[PDB]
């Protein structure tokens, strides 16, 4: 999904292995704030949210807690107290296109700043000039920003990047999102220390 209308998915009641991905070494950006990223699927949260969108490399630095700029103020904003992770990888081979891929749009105008992570639900028009627009996009009254021009022969700052933001919800509820149960082989006829799943 484009950054103005990013896609949030809730995840609960399942087994997750983070070290396959965190240790996969396949992403260009993997920054975790709050929780340690290094093999800390030894925790259990109520819900896990995954927010997916598309930006450009120049803007990847703007998808971060308490960041300011076009995308952060107008497209996707994260709060400073972000207890989560951000992953991102260059998708020029998948989101570019000969003659340009113009499918991703970004919001360029807003009266205020974005209140921690919202998306292009209400997508109206905003007055960007002196007096009322009263209709057809025109003089001192237009659209937000255009499409992204993700041509494959772009500079890195202009190339498409796919971003997934994972948030970890731990409310006053039974936590169900845990990761592995590293079982071991069993033995017999010898005094041992045991841990029989609890």
């Amino acid at each position, epitope marked *: 999904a484009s950054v103005y209308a990013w896609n949030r998915k809730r995840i609960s009641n399942c087994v997750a292995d983070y070290s396959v991905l965190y240790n996969s070494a396949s992403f260009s950006t993997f920054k975790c704030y709050g929780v340690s990223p290094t093999k800390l699927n030894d925790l259990c949260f109520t819900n896990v949210y995954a927010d997916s969108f598309v930006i450009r490399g120049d803007e990847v630095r703007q998808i971060a807690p308490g960041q300011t700029g076009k995308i952060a103020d107008y497209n996707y904003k994260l709060p400073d107290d972000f207890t989560g992770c951000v992953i991102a990888w260059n998708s020029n081979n998948l989101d570019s296109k000969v003659g340009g891929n113009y499918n991703y749009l970004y919001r*360029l*105008f807003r009266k205020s700043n974005l209140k921690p992570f919202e998306r292009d639900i209400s997508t109206e028009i905003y007055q*960007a*000039g*002196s007096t009322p627009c009263n209709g*057809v*996009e*025109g*003089f*001192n009254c*237009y*659209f937000p920003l*255009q499409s992204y021009g993700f041509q494959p022969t772009n500079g890195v700052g202009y190339q498409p990047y796919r971003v997934v933001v994972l948030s970890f919800e731990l409310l006053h509820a039974p936590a169900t999102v845990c990761g592995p149960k590293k079982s071991t082989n069993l033995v017999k006829n010898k005094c041992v220390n045991f841990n029989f799943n609890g």
Partner: antibody
Amino acid sequence: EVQLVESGPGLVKPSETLSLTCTVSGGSISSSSYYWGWIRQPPGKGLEWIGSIYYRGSTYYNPSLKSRVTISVDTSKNQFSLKLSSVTAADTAVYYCARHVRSAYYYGSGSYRDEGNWFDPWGQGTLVTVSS
Amino acid sequence: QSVLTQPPSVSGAPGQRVTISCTGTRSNIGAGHDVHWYQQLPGTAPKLLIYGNNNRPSGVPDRFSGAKSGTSASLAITGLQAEDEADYYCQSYDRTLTSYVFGTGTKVTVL
């Protein structure tokens, strides 16, 4: 990388309709907020704004010449045509067409200045004489 | 009415300060939408030299400055150099005519 080229008749008689064509490259007249304008320069004088057209077919003309000036676009050929009715020898001058890149200077206030000020790129110009 | 007023020429010797005035009306230089300055050879595409009364586009030497007050504006060239031998035009939107009005222009020569 931006090119503009004006074409038309070098001599027109008074009261007749003048048709000038501007062929451009380096930009599309279909881009959001992009503009295409016409400007005149009378003999040995300063530049005089004539009219402007937008990607959305909106257009303005100088009020004193509004009723006699008409600008049209042809997206398929990336061309702009200017027609001037009831011409007179007073309209003899060099005509320039020009590109206006989306809104204003987007960096700095967010292009929140009508149209910044004007344009940048220019064509070679065409001299049109009105006489019978 | 349709034209901003500039002195038709301004001169000086290399290294001098040369200023160009630009006389408008209430609707453009006065209560209008700021005055810009242009610098390009006669008959060739102009190039923005000063924007928003006093901003400079990148590529314009820092020695070009603009000023506005009331219905009058000026361009200052602070250390006239051989490259400054061009035409200079001021320009501003006129709210009464609803037109973007250029100045009549000034040619500088480095004597």
